């Protein structure tokens, strides 16, 4: 099985902060380390496939967003926040080295929820990101 | 003549995908190589020149978006290119001079600049292509 | 006292142009050098401090946005600069300490920070200027 890039690239950006969070400029997903408890929901990624009725929809994370496990990477390319990626509808998906594809072919379209994998309330403040690219599995 | 930078910089981003395009995020201008036929319309650029009553409104593309009097979107790898044609929705007369696309007549013009595929290029490798244009006048 | 980074980073982008102003993009703030008079208002930065009921809300500008107790927008060339004044429309009391703009009183303040031109600089070369500010507290 190999992932074929065929879609747009989405990004989940989260700004971890101390209890005293000062949101300057535009508004984004901001969370204090304290809120980084297990199962804690981060953002959500909207996916929409077209003309994929004979292929398995899949999402591919940047090389710096997965290892052995998905996680958001700090701007320093150091600190990481381990998260779990699952669709809103209870569709069945598989995780294969940075790839998250649907077990059944079809032009699926829904929401992919991002949650904190295990309490990590000690996560250093900063800007974390998680990039995912559309495509199919085959 | 020469182009004088005096305005904002706009960008036309197109994502080329295979027949099975999976849009992660929301939203962009995605198109399958199959749709990359000749005259195929990509995105559109809205232009608004003001105080240009004695000058000629002009648009300047990045050095990596033009060559030999030909405009094209560049891949994120600064390698693959999609040749496109620049033309206003209204049939106004413009001129192309080395990456510069200026209007033949002076005055403050405003409207939409349509971007179309120049010749069928359905073999264009998938990826993220862009076309940057900067506002200014010609002299 | 030192500034502790704890919030998001905002940015004020301005595009100085000549009287002939050609807007190519969808939306991006533009202004001709002529409008760059003293007290001239640029953009505005929204500030939302939360859980800061025992800390002094503060804003920190990039190293290339301040110098000698003076704030300014920097050109894309890291050369030209537009000196501006930072002030809360709440008329609240703030202090400027080497790139840091913090509130004199603790509390989870939330409002608008107005950006105005510091002294007439109508000769400012055209280009893209920016001013980055990061949320956090002072102590």
From Swiss-Prot, chains B, C:
Taxonomy, superkingdom: Bacteria
Ranges for region Receptor-binding: 2-55
UniProt-reported outcome of changing residue 39 to T: In strain: AL847
SUPFAM superfamilies the record matches: Bacterial adhesins
Assigned keywords, A-Z: Fimbrium, Plasmid, Signal
Main location: other
Pfam families given in the database record: Adhesin_Dr, Dr_adhesin
GO CC, alphabetical: pilus
Gene3D superfamilies: Dr adhesin
Subcellular location: Fimbrium
Known role: Hemagglutinins of uropathogenic E.coli mediate adherence to the upper urinary tract. These adhesins bind to the Dr blood group antigen and also agglutinate human erythrocytes in the presence of D-mannose (mannose-resistant hemagglutination (MRHA)).
Family: Belongs to the Dr-adhesin family.
Name under which the protein is recorded: Afimbrial adhesin AFA-III
Gene from which the chain derives: afaE3
């Amino acid at each position: 099985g190999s992932f074929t890039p065929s879609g747009t690239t989405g990004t989940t950006k989260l700004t971890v902060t101390e209890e005293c969070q000062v949101r300057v400029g535009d508004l984004t997903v901001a969370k204090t380390r304290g809120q980084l408890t297990d199962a804690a929901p981060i953002g959500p990624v909207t996916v929409q496939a077209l003309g994929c009725n004979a292929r398995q929809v899949a999402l591919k994370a940047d090389t710096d967003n997965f290892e052995q496990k998905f996680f958001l990477i700090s701007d320093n390319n150091r600190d990481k926040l381990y998260v779990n990626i699952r669709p809103m509808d209870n569709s069945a998906w598989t995780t294969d080295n940075g790839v998250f594809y649907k077990n059944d072919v079809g032009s699926w379209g829904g929401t992919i929820g991002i949650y904190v994998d295990g309490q990590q309330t000690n996560t250093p403040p900063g800007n974390y990101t998680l990039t995912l690219t559309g495509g199919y599995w085959a």
